[PDB]
Amino acid sequence: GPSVFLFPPKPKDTLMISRTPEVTCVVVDVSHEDPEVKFNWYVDGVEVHNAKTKPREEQYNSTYRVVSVLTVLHQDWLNGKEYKCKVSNKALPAPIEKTISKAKGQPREPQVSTLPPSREEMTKNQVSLMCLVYGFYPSDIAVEWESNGQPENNYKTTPPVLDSDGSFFLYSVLTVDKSRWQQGNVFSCSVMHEALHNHYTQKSLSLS
């Protein structure tokens, strides 16, 4: 029979008012014989009607996947509203319901510790810059890098790690050509999290 997965919005989308967060209800293993899927969506138990219906798409072995996307309001998500996807299909004994919402608990503001290139690092042709981001709650967070108002994409970020006080931490590492660092260019890690003022902070590194 079909399976249902309800994906939360991307943290960056819920935190930036200019972006559009959405929850995504994914139904896989829909049979060729009983392929109609009906979606009902609810926000705190109240039915909403603005979801997009996507055309079914082919999977292997005579099945389809069928997806429905509901745009959410940033403030609704951040206020802890519950989004429910109800999935109806003839092959299902009963409709499948999934509910998702933001993690509960007191939000806590991320702190950042920066780390410039090690002594050994400065001998190579590429250097690494690090931002350790810590003490935040919920674990939903977005970390990106930039320099001189342009994005810097050559970075890797660990998953959030649970700390002993129930907050989270991670690190992000940007790797750049050493010449760009030696020139004196400033590189910054931008952090977006709901507990920050205006959801945003930035820390900077340059050759000192």
Binding site: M16, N198, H199, Y200
Partner: peptide
């Protein structure tokens, strides 16, 4: 009092 990220609006207070 608004925060901007790479020219895009983040949030306002």
């Amino acid at each position: 009092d608004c925060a901007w990220h790479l020219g895009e609006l983040v949030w306002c207070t």
